Ligand binder design. Structure first.
Ligand SMILES: [K+]
Ligand SMILES: [K+]
Ligand SMILES: [K+]
Ligand SMILES: [K+]
Ligand SMILES: [K+]
Ligand SMILES: [K+]
Ligand SMILES: [K+]
Lengths: 106, 103, 103, 103, 103, 106
Protein backbone atom coordinates (compact mmCIF):
# COMPACT_ATOMS: atom_id res chain seq x y z
CA UNK A 1 0.00 0.00 0.00
CA UNK A 2 1.03 3.59 -0.61
CA UNK A 3 2.77 5.31 2.24
CA UNK A 4 2.30 9.00 2.82
CA UNK A 5 5.10 10.59 4.86
CA UNK A 6 4.41 13.90 6.56
CA UNK A 7 7.49 15.56 8.01
CA UNK A 8 8.11 17.66 9.96
CA UNK A 9 5.49 16.44 12.43
CA UNK A 10 5.19 19.86 14.02
CA UNK A 11 5.58 23.24 12.35
CA UNK A 12 6.26 26.45 14.28
CA UNK A 13 5.68 29.77 12.61
CA UNK A 14 5.08 33.47 13.39
CA UNK A 15 1.68 35.07 12.67
CA UNK A 16 1.17 36.31 9.12
CA UNK A 17 4.15 34.32 7.85
CA UNK A 18 3.91 31.82 4.96
CA UNK A 19 3.98 28.11 5.83
CA UNK A 20 4.22 24.76 4.01
CA UNK A 21 3.64 21.12 5.08
CA UNK A 22 5.08 18.38 2.91
CA UNK A 23 3.59 15.02 2.00
CA UNK A 24 5.66 12.35 0.28
CA UNK A 25 4.13 9.30 -1.39
CA UNK A 26 6.11 6.05 -1.42
CA UNK A 27 5.35 5.94 -5.16
CA UNK A 28 4.13 8.18 -7.97
CA UNK A 29 0.46 9.01 -7.47
CA UNK A 30 -0.01 11.75 -10.09
CA UNK A 31 -2.08 14.44 -8.43
CA UNK A 32 -4.38 12.06 -6.57
CA UNK A 33 -3.53 13.64 -3.25
CA UNK A 34 -6.03 15.57 -1.06
CA UNK A 35 -5.65 17.72 2.03
CA UNK A 36 -7.68 17.72 5.23
CA UNK A 37 -7.77 20.03 8.21
CA UNK A 38 -8.79 18.96 11.71
CA UNK A 39 -8.91 21.37 14.63
CA UNK A 40 -8.98 20.26 18.27
CA UNK A 41 -12.07 18.03 18.65
CA UNK A 42 -13.54 18.63 15.20
CA UNK A 43 -13.83 16.24 12.28
CA UNK A 44 -11.64 16.50 9.20
CA UNK A 45 -12.44 19.27 6.70
CA UNK A 46 -11.43 19.06 3.02
CA UNK A 47 -9.00 21.91 2.17
CA UNK A 48 -7.56 21.01 -1.23
CA UNK A 49 -8.49 18.15 -3.54
CA UNK A 50 -6.43 16.59 -6.30
CA UNK A 51 -3.26 18.29 -5.07
CA UNK A 52 -4.17 21.79 -6.25
CA UNK A 53 -7.91 22.17 -6.89
CA UNK A 54 -9.58 24.44 -4.34
CA UNK A 55 -12.80 23.67 -2.50
CA UNK A 56 -15.49 26.31 -2.00
CA UNK A 57 -15.71 27.81 1.46
CA UNK A 58 -11.99 27.47 2.06
CA UNK A 59 -10.03 30.69 2.67
CA UNK A 60 -8.20 31.69 -0.52
CA UNK A 61 -5.26 31.57 1.90
CA UNK A 62 -4.86 27.79 1.29
CA UNK A 63 -3.14 26.44 -1.81
CA UNK A 64 -1.80 23.09 -2.91
CA UNK A 65 0.95 21.98 -5.29
CA UNK A 66 2.94 18.96 -6.40
CA UNK A 67 2.69 15.88 -8.57
CA UNK A 68 4.08 12.36 -8.50
CA UNK A 69 5.55 11.80 -5.05
CA UNK A 70 6.08 15.26 -3.60
CA UNK A 71 3.11 17.38 -2.53
CA UNK A 72 2.87 20.67 -0.67
CA UNK A 73 -0.02 22.38 1.15
CA UNK A 74 0.74 26.06 1.70
CA UNK A 75 -0.96 28.71 3.81
CA UNK A 76 -0.04 32.23 2.72
CA UNK A 77 -0.22 34.31 5.93
CA UNK A 78 -0.95 31.98 8.84
CA UNK A 79 -3.36 32.96 11.58
CA UNK A 80 -4.74 31.58 14.81
CA UNK A 81 -7.71 29.88 13.15
CA UNK A 82 -5.16 27.78 11.24
CA UNK A 83 -3.91 26.03 14.35
CA UNK A 84 -4.85 22.40 13.71
CA UNK A 85 -3.59 19.08 12.36
CA UNK A 86 -3.17 18.65 8.64
CA UNK A 87 -3.38 15.33 6.84
CA UNK A 88 -2.86 14.22 3.27
CA UNK A 89 -4.74 11.35 1.61
CA UNK A 90 -4.26 9.56 -1.71
CA UNK A 91 -6.80 7.99 -4.05
CA UNK A 92 -4.37 6.86 -6.74
CA UNK A 93 -4.34 3.21 -5.72
CA UNK A 94 -6.52 1.09 -3.47
CA UNK A 95 -6.79 1.33 -0.55
CA UNK A 96 -6.95 5.06 0.12
CA UNK A 97 -4.32 5.88 2.73
CA UNK A 98 -3.59 8.74 5.11
CA UNK A 99 -0.51 10.64 6.19
CA UNK A 100 0.69 10.64 9.78
CA UNK A 101 -0.32 14.29 10.20
CA UNK A 102 1.48 17.62 10.78
CA UNK A 103 0.50 19.94 13.66
CA UNK A 104 0.64 23.66 12.86
CA UNK A 105 1.78 25.68 15.80
CA UNK A 106 1.97 29.47 15.99
CA UNK B 1 -35.33 4.57 -42.76
CA UNK B 2 -32.82 1.91 -43.92
CA UNK B 3 -31.77 -0.91 -41.57
CA UNK B 4 -28.00 -0.43 -41.76
CA UNK B 5 -28.50 3.14 -40.56
CA UNK B 6 -30.80 2.05 -37.74
CA UNK B 7 -28.30 -0.52 -36.58
CA UNK B 8 -25.46 2.02 -36.71
CA UNK B 9 -27.52 4.33 -34.55
CA UNK B 10 -28.48 1.58 -32.14
CA UNK B 11 -24.87 0.46 -31.98
CA UNK B 12 -23.91 3.97 -30.84
CA UNK B 13 -26.54 4.39 -28.14
CA UNK B 14 -25.61 0.90 -27.02
CA UNK B 15 -21.87 1.54 -26.96
CA UNK B 16 -22.50 4.61 -24.82
CA UNK B 17 -24.59 2.59 -22.40
CA UNK B 18 -21.87 -0.05 -22.20
CA UNK B 19 -19.19 2.59 -21.65
CA UNK B 20 -21.14 4.06 -18.74
CA UNK B 21 -22.05 0.71 -17.20
CA UNK B 22 -18.51 -0.46 -17.94
CA UNK B 23 -17.13 2.46 -15.99
CA UNK B 24 -19.39 1.73 -13.01
CA UNK B 25 -18.82 -2.01 -12.98
CA UNK B 26 -15.06 -1.59 -13.34
CA UNK B 27 -14.72 0.59 -10.22
CA UNK B 28 -17.03 -1.75 -8.38
CA UNK B 29 -14.93 -4.78 -9.30
CA UNK B 30 -11.48 -3.17 -8.91
CA UNK B 31 -11.94 -1.51 -5.49
CA UNK B 32 -10.87 -3.97 -2.84
CA UNK B 33 -7.88 -5.17 -4.88
CA UNK B 34 -4.59 -3.77 -3.47
CA UNK B 35 -2.66 -1.72 -6.01
CA UNK B 36 -5.62 -1.34 -8.36
CA UNK B 37 -5.86 2.03 -10.11
CA UNK B 38 -9.16 1.65 -11.96
CA UNK B 39 -10.99 2.91 -8.86
CA UNK B 40 -12.70 6.26 -9.51
CA UNK B 41 -15.56 6.88 -11.94
CA UNK B 42 -14.11 9.70 -14.04
CA UNK B 43 -10.93 7.92 -15.04
CA UNK B 44 -12.78 4.62 -15.32
CA UNK B 45 -14.94 6.25 -17.97
CA UNK B 46 -11.78 7.42 -19.76
CA UNK B 47 -10.53 3.88 -19.39
CA UNK B 48 -13.56 2.22 -20.93
CA UNK B 49 -13.61 4.69 -23.83
CA UNK B 50 -9.96 4.04 -24.64
CA UNK B 51 -10.73 0.35 -24.30
CA UNK B 52 -13.83 0.41 -26.49
CA UNK B 53 -11.86 2.17 -29.19
CA UNK B 54 -9.22 -0.47 -28.56
CA UNK B 55 -6.55 2.19 -28.06
CA UNK B 56 -5.66 1.22 -24.47
CA UNK B 57 -2.65 3.38 -23.50
CA UNK B 58 -1.80 1.32 -20.43
CA UNK B 59 -2.18 4.21 -18.00
CA UNK B 60 -5.20 2.37 -16.65
CA UNK B 61 -6.33 -1.27 -16.75
CA UNK B 62 -8.21 -3.74 -14.52
CA UNK B 63 -6.31 -6.22 -12.41
CA UNK B 64 -9.23 -8.27 -11.01
CA UNK B 65 -11.12 -11.06 -12.79
CA UNK B 66 -14.44 -9.19 -12.88
CA UNK B 67 -12.72 -6.00 -13.97
CA UNK B 68 -11.12 -7.83 -16.87
CA UNK B 69 -14.43 -9.50 -17.63
CA UNK B 70 -15.96 -6.04 -17.79
CA UNK B 71 -13.06 -5.02 -20.02
CA UNK B 72 -13.72 -7.81 -22.52
CA UNK B 73 -17.37 -6.81 -22.85
CA UNK B 74 -16.39 -3.21 -23.42
CA UNK B 75 -13.70 -4.20 -25.98
CA UNK B 76 -16.15 -6.39 -27.88
CA UNK B 77 -18.92 -3.78 -27.81
CA UNK B 78 -16.59 -1.08 -29.08
CA UNK B 79 -15.25 -3.36 -31.79
CA UNK B 80 -18.67 -4.57 -32.87
CA UNK B 81 -20.18 -1.09 -32.82
CA UNK B 82 -17.46 0.52 -34.91
CA UNK B 83 -17.43 -2.46 -37.23
CA UNK B 84 -21.16 -2.21 -37.61
CA UNK B 85 -20.75 1.40 -38.75
CA UNK B 86 -18.14 0.39 -41.33
CA UNK B 87 -20.64 -2.19 -42.52
CA UNK B 88 -23.28 0.51 -42.79
CA UNK B 89 -20.92 2.72 -44.80
CA UNK B 90 -20.38 -0.22 -47.15
CA UNK B 91 -24.08 -0.92 -47.69
CA UNK B 92 -24.41 2.78 -48.43
CA UNK B 93 -21.57 2.87 -50.97
CA UNK B 94 -22.60 -0.46 -52.53
CA UNK B 95 -26.25 0.59 -52.80
CA UNK B 96 -25.38 3.88 -54.47
CA UNK B 97 -22.78 2.49 -56.88
CA UNK B 98 -25.61 0.36 -58.23
CA UNK B 99 -27.39 3.66 -58.91
CA UNK B 100 -24.49 5.37 -60.70
CA UNK B 101 -24.96 2.43 -63.12
CA UNK B 102 -28.76 2.24 -63.34
CA UNK B 103 -30.40 -0.40 -61.10
CA UNK C 1 -28.45 -20.95 -42.95
CA UNK C 2 -26.45 -18.27 -44.83
CA UNK C 3 -22.67 -18.62 -45.26
CA UNK C 4 -21.63 -15.25 -43.82
CA UNK C 5 -23.41 -16.19 -40.61
CA UNK C 6 -21.79 -19.63 -40.51
CA UNK C 7 -18.36 -18.11 -40.99
CA UNK C 8 -19.00 -15.53 -38.26
CA UNK C 9 -19.95 -18.33 -35.92
CA UNK C 10 -16.97 -20.45 -36.89
CA UNK C 11 -14.71 -17.44 -36.50
CA UNK C 12 -15.91 -17.10 -32.91
CA UNK C 13 -15.50 -20.71 -31.85
CA UNK C 14 -12.12 -20.56 -33.53
CA UNK C 15 -11.03 -17.35 -31.84
CA UNK C 16 -11.92 -18.88 -28.49
CA UNK C 17 -9.86 -21.97 -29.26
CA UNK C 18 -6.92 -19.78 -30.28
CA UNK C 19 -7.26 -17.67 -27.13
CA UNK C 20 -7.13 -20.78 -24.95
CA UNK C 21 -4.29 -22.43 -26.87
CA UNK C 22 -2.60 -19.03 -27.06
CA UNK C 23 -2.73 -18.74 -23.30
CA UNK C 24 -1.23 -22.22 -22.83
CA UNK C 25 1.49 -21.83 -25.45
CA UNK C 26 2.45 -18.39 -24.15
CA UNK C 27 3.15 -19.62 -20.60
CA UNK C 28 4.96 -22.60 -22.03
CA UNK C 29 7.19 -20.40 -24.17
CA UNK C 30 7.74 -17.57 -21.66
CA UNK C 31 8.66 -19.65 -18.57
CA UNK C 32 12.40 -20.12 -18.55
CA UNK C 33 13.06 -16.54 -19.69
CA UNK C 34 14.33 -14.37 -16.79
CA UNK C 35 12.12 -11.37 -16.12
CA UNK C 36 9.20 -12.74 -18.12
CA UNK C 37 5.75 -11.98 -16.67
CA UNK C 38 3.53 -13.90 -19.07
CA UNK C 39 3.96 -17.01 -16.90
CA UNK C 40 0.67 -18.07 -15.29
CA UNK C 41 -2.43 -19.30 -17.13
CA UNK C 42 -5.07 -16.92 -15.78
CA UNK C 43 -3.28 -13.71 -16.70
CA UNK C 44 -2.00 -15.26 -19.92
CA UNK C 45 -5.64 -15.76 -20.91
CA UNK C 46 -6.31 -12.09 -20.07
CA UNK C 47 -3.25 -11.29 -22.13
CA UNK C 48 -4.33 -13.19 -25.22
CA UNK C 49 -7.84 -11.70 -25.07
CA UNK C 50 -6.50 -8.16 -24.87
CA UNK C 51 -4.15 -9.09 -27.70
CA UNK C 52 -6.81 -10.67 -29.90
CA UNK C 53 -8.93 -7.55 -29.51
CA UNK C 54 -5.75 -5.67 -30.31
CA UNK C 55 -6.13 -3.54 -27.18
CA UNK C 56 -2.83 -4.60 -25.55
CA UNK C 57 -2.45 -2.43 -22.42
CA UNK C 58 1.20 -3.30 -21.91
CA UNK C 59 0.71 -4.77 -18.45
CA UNK C 60 1.60 -8.11 -20.00
CA UNK C 61 3.49 -9.12 -23.16
CA UNK C 62 5.81 -11.94 -24.31
CA UNK C 63 9.55 -11.43 -24.35
CA UNK C 64 10.64 -14.70 -26.00
CA UNK C 65 10.60 -15.52 -29.72
CA UNK C 66 8.00 -18.29 -29.41
CA UNK C 67 5.88 -16.18 -27.11
CA UNK C 68 5.85 -13.38 -29.66
CA UNK C 69 5.16 -15.90 -32.40
CA UNK C 70 2.18 -17.06 -30.37
CA UNK C 71 1.22 -13.40 -29.98
CA UNK C 72 1.19 -12.79 -33.74
CA UNK C 73 -1.12 -15.75 -34.32
CA UNK C 74 -3.47 -14.51 -31.64
CA UNK C 75 -3.40 -10.93 -33.03
CA UNK C 76 -4.14 -12.15 -36.54
CA UNK C 77 -6.90 -14.51 -35.41
CA UNK C 78 -8.58 -11.79 -33.38
CA UNK C 79 -8.29 -9.32 -36.25
CA UNK C 80 -9.53 -11.77 -38.85
CA UNK C 81 -12.39 -13.00 -36.68
CA UNK C 82 -13.71 -9.57 -35.83
CA UNK C 83 -13.23 -8.45 -39.41
CA UNK C 84 -15.10 -11.48 -40.61
CA UNK C 85 -18.05 -10.45 -38.44
CA UNK C 86 -18.01 -6.93 -39.86
CA UNK C 87 -18.06 -8.56 -43.28
CA UNK C 88 -21.05 -10.63 -42.23
CA UNK C 89 -22.87 -7.52 -41.00
CA UNK C 90 -22.23 -5.95 -44.40
CA UNK C 91 -23.57 -8.89 -46.40
CA UNK C 92 -26.61 -8.71 -44.15
CA UNK C 93 -27.17 -4.98 -44.67
CA UNK C 94 -26.39 -5.18 -48.40
CA UNK C 95 -28.69 -8.16 -48.91
CA UNK C 96 -31.59 -6.48 -47.13
CA UNK C 97 -31.19 -3.06 -48.76
CA UNK C 98 -31.77 -4.89 -52.04
CA UNK C 99 -35.08 -5.99 -50.50
CA UNK C 100 -36.21 -2.55 -49.34
CA UNK C 101 -36.01 -1.81 -53.11
CA UNK C 102 -37.52 -4.99 -54.56
CA UNK C 103 -34.99 -7.60 -55.77
CA UNK D 1 -15.93 9.93 -59.89
CA UNK D 2 -17.60 7.33 -57.62
CA UNK D 3 -18.89 8.33 -54.17
CA UNK D 4 -17.05 5.72 -52.10
CA UNK D 5 -13.79 7.04 -53.53
CA UNK D 6 -14.74 10.65 -52.81
CA UNK D 7 -15.62 9.80 -49.24
CA UNK D 8 -12.35 7.91 -48.77
CA UNK D 9 -10.49 10.95 -50.01
CA UNK D 10 -12.48 13.32 -47.84
CA UNK D 11 -11.98 11.03 -44.87
CA UNK D 12 -8.21 11.36 -45.36
CA UNK D 13 -8.03 15.12 -45.69
CA UNK D 14 -10.33 15.26 -42.70
CA UNK D 15 -8.29 12.86 -40.58
CA UNK D 16 -5.21 14.97 -41.28
CA UNK D 17 -7.02 18.11 -40.21
CA UNK D 18 -8.17 16.39 -37.02
CA UNK D 19 -4.66 15.11 -36.31
CA UNK D 20 -3.24 18.63 -36.62
CA UNK D 21 -6.01 20.29 -34.62
CA UNK D 22 -5.86 17.38 -32.19
CA UNK D 23 -2.18 18.01 -31.65
CA UNK D 24 -2.77 21.72 -31.00
CA UNK D 25 -5.77 21.27 -28.73
CA UNK D 26 -4.03 18.53 -26.74
CA UNK D 27 -1.04 20.71 -25.82
CA UNK D 28 -3.39 23.55 -25.05
CA UNK D 29 -5.47 21.40 -22.72
CA UNK D 30 -2.60 19.46 -21.09
CA UNK D 31 -0.27 22.38 -20.23
CA UNK D 32 -1.14 23.61 -16.78
CA UNK D 33 -1.64 20.06 -15.44
CA UNK D 34 1.30 19.00 -13.22
CA UNK D 35 3.03 15.87 -14.48
CA UNK D 36 1.46 16.07 -17.93
CA UNK D 37 3.73 15.00 -20.80
CA UNK D 38 1.52 15.77 -23.79
CA UNK D 39 2.86 19.34 -23.81
CA UNK D 40 4.88 20.07 -26.96
CA UNK D 41 3.53 20.13 -30.51
CA UNK D 42 5.88 17.68 -32.22
CA UNK D 43 5.28 14.78 -29.86
CA UNK D 44 1.61 15.71 -29.55
CA UNK D 45 1.33 15.18 -33.30
CA UNK D 46 3.03 11.78 -32.90
CA UNK D 47 0.57 11.14 -30.10
CA UNK D 48 -2.54 11.94 -32.10
CA UNK D 49 -1.34 9.85 -35.05
CA UNK D 50 -0.71 6.83 -32.86
CA UNK D 51 -4.10 7.49 -31.30
CA UNK D 52 -5.96 7.89 -34.58
CA UNK D 53 -4.50 4.60 -35.77
CA UNK D 54 -5.55 3.27 -32.39
CA UNK D 55 -2.04 1.96 -31.72
CA UNK D 56 -1.40 4.04 -28.58
CA UNK D 57 1.95 2.85 -27.18
CA UNK D 58 1.47 4.54 -23.82
CA UNK D 59 4.58 6.70 -24.10
CA UNK D 60 2.23 9.65 -24.33
CA UNK D 61 -1.40 10.22 -23.28
CA UNK D 62 -3.57 13.08 -21.95
CA UNK D 63 -4.30 13.34 -18.26
CA UNK D 64 -6.77 16.26 -18.30
CA UNK D 65 -10.49 16.09 -19.13
CA UNK D 66 -10.21 18.26 -22.26
CA UNK D 67 -7.12 16.40 -23.39
CA UNK D 68 -8.98 13.12 -23.13
CA UNK D 69 -11.97 14.68 -24.85
CA UNK D 70 -9.63 15.66 -27.67
CA UNK D 71 -8.31 12.10 -27.61
CA UNK D 72 -11.76 10.58 -28.08
CA UNK D 73 -12.44 12.76 -31.11
CA UNK D 74 -9.12 11.78 -32.63
CA UNK D 75 -9.73 8.06 -31.89
CA UNK D 76 -13.17 8.19 -33.46
CA UNK D 77 -11.99 10.13 -36.50
CA UNK D 78 -9.14 7.72 -37.11
CA UNK D 79 -11.44 4.73 -36.67
CA UNK D 80 -14.16 6.14 -38.88
CA UNK D 81 -11.73 7.27 -41.57
CA UNK D 82 -9.93 3.96 -41.85
CA UNK D 83 -13.22 2.11 -41.68
CA UNK D 84 -14.60 4.29 -44.41
CA UNK D 85 -11.68 3.25 -46.63
CA UNK D 86 -12.33 -0.43 -45.94
CA UNK D 87 -15.91 0.26 -46.94
CA UNK D 88 -14.71 1.86 -50.15
CA UNK D 89 -12.51 -1.15 -50.91
CA UNK D 90 -15.56 -3.35 -50.45
CA UNK D 91 -17.79 -1.34 -52.78
CA UNK D 92 -14.96 -1.57 -55.28
CA UNK D 93 -14.57 -5.35 -54.97
CA UNK D 94 -18.34 -5.93 -54.87
CA UNK D 95 -18.95 -3.71 -57.89
CA UNK D 96 -16.29 -5.45 -59.96
CA UNK D 97 -17.23 -9.01 -58.98
CA UNK D 98 -20.61 -8.22 -60.52
CA UNK D 99 -18.66 -7.47 -63.71
CA UNK D 100 -16.61 -10.67 -63.75
CA UNK D 101 -20.10 -12.26 -63.97
CA UNK D 102 -21.82 -9.93 -66.44
CA UNK D 103 -24.05 -7.24 -64.86
CA UNK E 1 -9.05 -15.59 -60.08
CA UNK E 2 -11.24 -12.85 -58.54
CA UNK E 3 -9.80 -9.38 -57.86
CA UNK E 4 -10.68 -9.10 -54.16
CA UNK E 5 -8.70 -12.29 -53.57
CA UNK E 6 -5.73 -11.03 -55.58
CA UNK E 7 -5.69 -7.79 -53.65
CA UNK E 8 -5.89 -9.64 -50.32
CA UNK E 9 -2.92 -11.71 -51.37
CA UNK E 10 -0.97 -8.71 -52.59
CA UNK E 11 -1.82 -6.87 -49.39
CA UNK E 12 -0.21 -9.71 -47.43
CA UNK E 13 3.01 -9.98 -49.40
CA UNK E 14 3.16 -6.21 -49.20
CA UNK E 15 2.55 -6.03 -45.46
CA UNK E 16 5.37 -8.52 -44.96
CA UNK E 17 7.71 -6.44 -47.07
CA UNK E 18 6.78 -3.33 -45.10
CA UNK E 19 7.28 -5.15 -41.79
CA UNK E 20 10.77 -6.22 -42.83
CA UNK E 21 11.75 -2.84 -44.28
CA UNK E 22 10.05 -1.20 -41.31
CA UNK E 23 12.22 -3.19 -38.96
CA UNK E 24 15.40 -2.23 -40.83
CA UNK E 25 14.54 1.45 -41.20
CA UNK E 26 13.48 1.72 -37.56
CA UNK E 27 16.84 0.51 -36.20
CA UNK E 28 18.60 2.71 -38.70
CA UNK E 29 16.65 5.78 -37.59
CA UNK E 30 16.62 5.06 -33.84
CA UNK E 31 20.33 4.25 -33.31
CA UNK E 32 22.13 7.45 -32.48
CA UNK E 33 19.30 8.69 -30.24
CA UNK E 34 20.23 8.39 -26.54
CA UNK E 35 17.81 6.22 -24.59
CA UNK E 36 16.28 4.67 -27.69
CA UNK E 37 15.35 0.99 -27.36
CA UNK E 38 14.21 0.22 -30.90
CA UNK E 39 17.82 -0.59 -31.85
CA UNK E 40 18.25 -4.27 -32.74
CA UNK E 41 16.66 -6.05 -35.71
CA UNK E 42 14.92 -8.94 -33.96
CA UNK E 43 12.92 -6.85 -31.52
CA UNK E 44 12.38 -4.17 -34.15
CA UNK E 45 10.64 -6.83 -36.24
CA UNK E 46 8.50 -7.73 -33.21
CA UNK E 47 7.85 -4.03 -32.84
CA UNK E 48 6.69 -3.46 -36.40
CA UNK E 49 4.43 -6.53 -36.29
CA UNK E 50 2.76 -5.37 -33.09
CA UNK E 51 2.49 -1.95 -34.70
CA UNK E 52 1.06 -3.19 -37.99
CA UNK E 53 -1.58 -5.13 -36.09
CA UNK E 54 -2.08 -1.92 -34.14
CA UNK E 55 -1.62 -3.77 -30.84
CA UNK E 56 1.42 -1.77 -29.66
CA UNK E 57 2.15 -2.96 -26.09
CA UNK E 58 4.48 -0.08 -25.31
CA UNK E 59 7.48 -2.28 -24.56
CA UNK E 60 9.03 -0.82 -27.69
CA UNK E 61 8.42 2.37 -29.69
CA UNK E 62 10.45 4.88 -31.74
CA UNK E 63 11.55 8.14 -30.21
CA UNK E 64 13.09 9.82 -33.28
CA UNK E 65 11.22 11.64 -36.07
CA UNK E 66 12.22 9.16 -38.79
CA UNK E 67 11.48 6.23 -36.53
CA UNK E 68 7.99 7.56 -35.92
CA UNK E 69 7.62 8.28 -39.62
CA UNK E 70 8.51 4.64 -40.24
CA UNK E 71 5.96 3.72 -37.57
CA UNK E 72 3.14 5.60 -39.30
CA UNK E 73 3.82 3.82 -42.59
CA UNK E 74 3.80 0.47 -40.84
CA UNK E 75 0.57 1.33 -38.93
CA UNK E 76 -1.16 2.42 -42.12
CA UNK E 77 0.03 -0.59 -44.10
CA UNK E 78 -1.13 -2.99 -41.41
CA UNK E 79 -4.48 -1.23 -41.13
CA UNK E 80 -5.02 -1.06 -44.86
CA UNK E 81 -3.94 -4.65 -45.43
CA UNK E 82 -6.18 -6.14 -42.77
CA UNK E 83 -9.02 -3.89 -43.86
CA UNK E 84 -8.53 -4.98 -47.42
CA UNK E 85 -8.98 -8.59 -46.31
CA UNK E 86 -12.20 -7.75 -44.47
CA UNK E 87 -13.33 -6.12 -47.70
CA UNK E 88 -12.48 -9.28 -49.59
CA UNK E 89 -14.45 -11.39 -47.11
CA UNK E 90 -17.41 -9.09 -47.70
CA UNK E 91 -17.28 -9.32 -51.49
CA UNK E 92 -17.16 -13.07 -51.00
CA UNK E 93 -20.17 -13.20 -48.67
CA UNK E 94 -22.12 -10.65 -50.74
CA UNK E 95 -21.39 -12.46 -54.00
CA UNK E 96 -22.49 -15.81 -52.62
CA UNK E 97 -25.64 -14.56 -50.87
CA UNK E 98 -26.76 -13.46 -54.32
CA UNK E 99 -26.35 -17.12 -55.30
CA UNK E 100 -28.32 -18.59 -52.39
CA UNK E 101 -31.14 -16.50 -53.96
CA UNK E 102 -30.58 -17.16 -57.67
CA UNK E 103 -28.64 -14.44 -59.53
CA UNK F 1 15.88 -12.05 -10.50
CA UNK F 2 13.53 -10.75 -7.83
CA UNK F 3 14.91 -10.65 -4.33
CA UNK F 4 12.67 -11.24 -1.37
CA UNK F 5 14.03 -9.80 1.88
CA UNK F 6 12.67 -11.17 5.14
CA UNK F 7 13.72 -9.19 8.19
CA UNK F 8 13.83 -9.58 11.10
CA UNK F 9 15.18 -13.11 10.79
CA UNK F 10 13.83 -14.09 14.19
CA UNK F 11 10.69 -12.82 15.88
CA UNK F 12 10.08 -13.11 19.63
CA UNK F 13 6.59 -12.68 20.98
CA UNK F 14 4.42 -13.50 24.02
CA UNK F 15 1.57 -16.03 23.74
CA UNK F 16 -1.74 -14.65 22.45
CA UNK F 17 -0.06 -11.50 21.16
CA UNK F 18 -0.36 -10.31 17.53
CA UNK F 19 2.67 -10.79 15.26
CA UNK F 20 3.81 -9.76 11.77
CA UNK F 21 6.65 -10.90 9.47
CA UNK F 22 7.64 -8.63 6.61
CA UNK F 23 8.69 -9.55 3.08
CA UNK F 24 10.15 -6.97 0.73
CA UNK F 25 10.49 -7.53 -3.02
CA UNK F 26 13.39 -5.89 -4.86
CA UNK F 27 10.77 -4.67 -7.34
CA UNK F 28 7.01 -4.25 -7.68
CA UNK F 29 5.34 -7.65 -7.91
CA UNK F 30 1.67 -6.66 -7.52
CA UNK F 31 0.15 -9.22 -5.19
CA UNK F 32 2.00 -12.21 -6.62
CA UNK F 33 3.43 -13.10 -3.24
CA UNK F 34 2.57 -16.31 -1.30
CA UNK F 35 3.29 -17.47 2.23
CA UNK F 36 4.54 -20.84 3.44
CA UNK F 37 4.90 -22.36 6.88
CA UNK F 38 7.44 -25.02 7.78
CA UNK F 39 7.68 -26.53 11.25
CA UNK F 40 10.72 -28.46 12.51
CA UNK F 41 11.21 -31.37 10.08
CA UNK F 42 8.03 -30.89 8.07
CA UNK F 43 7.61 -29.74 4.49
CA UNK F 44 6.33 -26.29 3.58
CA UNK F 45 2.59 -25.65 3.96
CA UNK F 46 0.76 -22.93 1.99
CA UNK F 47 -0.70 -20.33 4.40
CA UNK F 48 -1.72 -17.40 2.21
CA UNK F 49 -1.69 -17.11 -1.57
CA UNK F 50 -1.62 -13.99 -3.70
CA UNK F 51 -0.70 -11.83 -0.71
CA UNK F 52 -4.12 -11.92 0.95
CA UNK F 53 -6.25 -14.83 -0.31
CA UNK F 54 -6.77 -17.49 2.35
CA UNK F 55 -6.35 -21.22 1.83
CA UNK F 56 -8.83 -23.73 3.26
CA UNK F 57 -7.69 -25.61 6.32
CA UNK F 58 -5.61 -22.71 7.58
CA UNK F 59 -6.57 -21.23 10.97
CA UNK F 60 -8.56 -18.03 10.45
CA UNK F 61 -5.77 -16.70 12.69
CA UNK F 62 -3.51 -16.15 9.62
CA UNK F 63 -3.93 -13.14 7.34
CA UNK F 64 -1.91 -11.52 4.61
CA UNK F 65 -1.61 -7.98 3.26
CA UNK F 66 0.44 -5.79 0.96
CA UNK F 67 0.99 -4.99 -2.68
CA UNK F 68 3.90 -3.92 -4.85
CA UNK F 69 7.06 -4.40 -2.81
CA UNK F 70 5.92 -4.58 0.80
CA UNK F 71 4.04 -7.62 2.08
CA UNK F 72 2.96 -8.67 5.56
CA UNK F 73 1.87 -12.04 6.98
CA UNK F 74 0.10 -11.57 10.31
CA UNK F 75 -0.97 -14.03 12.99
CA UNK F 76 -3.62 -12.59 15.30
CA UNK F 77 -3.00 -14.30 18.66
CA UNK F 78 0.11 -16.46 18.37
CA UNK F 79 0.27 -19.89 19.93
CA UNK F 80 2.71 -22.75 20.34
CA UNK F 81 1.59 -24.52 17.17
CA UNK F 82 2.75 -21.42 15.28
CA UNK F 83 6.40 -21.95 16.16
CA UNK F 84 8.00 -22.53 12.76
CA UNK F 85 9.82 -20.86 9.89
CA UNK F 86 7.89 -18.63 7.53
CA UNK F 87 8.84 -18.00 3.93
CA UNK F 88 7.48 -15.78 1.19
CA UNK F 89 7.57 -16.65 -2.52
CA UNK F 90 6.81 -14.61 -5.64
CA UNK F 91 5.35 -15.67 -8.98
CA UNK F 92 5.32 -12.25 -10.62
CA UNK F 93 8.39 -12.84 -12.76
CA UNK F 94 10.37 -15.91 -13.74
CA UNK F 95 11.99 -17.60 -11.95
CA UNK F 96 9.90 -17.98 -8.81
CA UNK F 97 12.06 -16.99 -5.85
CA UNK F 98 11.99 -17.48 -2.09
CA UNK F 99 12.64 -15.32 0.93
CA UNK F 100 15.41 -16.08 3.39
CA UNK F 101 12.88 -17.07 6.06
CA UNK F 102 11.77 -15.72 9.46
CA UNK F 103 11.70 -17.95 12.57
CA UNK F 104 8.79 -17.33 14.95
CA UNK F 105 9.79 -17.77 18.53
CA UNK F 106 7.50 -17.60 21.55
K1 LIG G 1 0.27 0.34 -24.17
K1 LIG H 1 -5.97 -1.28 -31.74
K1 LIG I 1 -3.88 -0.74 -29.20
K1 LIG J 1 -1.86 -0.21 -26.75
K1 LIG K 1 3.03 1.07 -20.81
K1 LIG L 1 4.94 1.56 -18.49
K1 LIG M 1 -10.49 -2.46 -37.22
Amino acid sequence: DILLTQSPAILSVSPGERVSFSCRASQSIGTDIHWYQQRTNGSPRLLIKYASESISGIPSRFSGSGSGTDFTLSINSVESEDIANYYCQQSNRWPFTFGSGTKLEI
Amino acid sequence: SALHWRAAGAATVLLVIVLLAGSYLAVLAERGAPGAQLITYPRALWWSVQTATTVGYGDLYPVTLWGRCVAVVVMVAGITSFGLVTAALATWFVGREQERRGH
